[PDB]
Design a protein around this nucleic acid. Structure first.
Length: 111
DNA sequence: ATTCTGCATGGAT
DNA sequence: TATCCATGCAGAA
């Protein structure tokens, strides 16, 4: 029974990502790199656990963009606001190996 | 007015 | 020139 937390990537929140809309933008590069692959514009549900138990479930989804894709987690506001985040705070996504569990955390604006 | 969608745009680099 | 994500924006309800 030997486990490790492996950083995947971080996102520093925009107005949009922090705002009322509820969708958080993932750099395409990063999404394809560390989240499941998905081939439909409307993706798959994705359960990410926070440090203190709470499973959040977002639809992980893309759209066509230019000739590529734009990625988002949808329905984040509950998660965000539980964690008290504003634009300029940072959300870190990580993976627990061996296994494929997705976990997350966040930290507050530099100031 | 408002919110949800599903993109499309274009400023930043 | 190029990429590409923050934000715009036009339905639909």
């Amino acid at each position: 029974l030997n486990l490790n937390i492996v950083p995947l990537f971080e996102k520093t929140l925009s107005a949009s990502d922090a705002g009322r809309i509820g969708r958080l933008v993932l750099p395409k590069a990063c999404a394809e790199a560390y989240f499941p692959p998905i081939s439909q514009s409307e993706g798959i549900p994705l359960k990410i656990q926070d440090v203190r138990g709470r499973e959040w479930t977002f639809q992980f989804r893309y759209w066509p963009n230019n000739n590529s894709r734009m990625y988002v987690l949808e329905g984040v506001t509950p998660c965000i606001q539980s964690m008290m985040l504003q634009a300029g705070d940072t959300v870190t996504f990580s993976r627990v190996d061996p296994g494929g569990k997705l976990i997350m955390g966040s930290r507050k604006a530099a100031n």
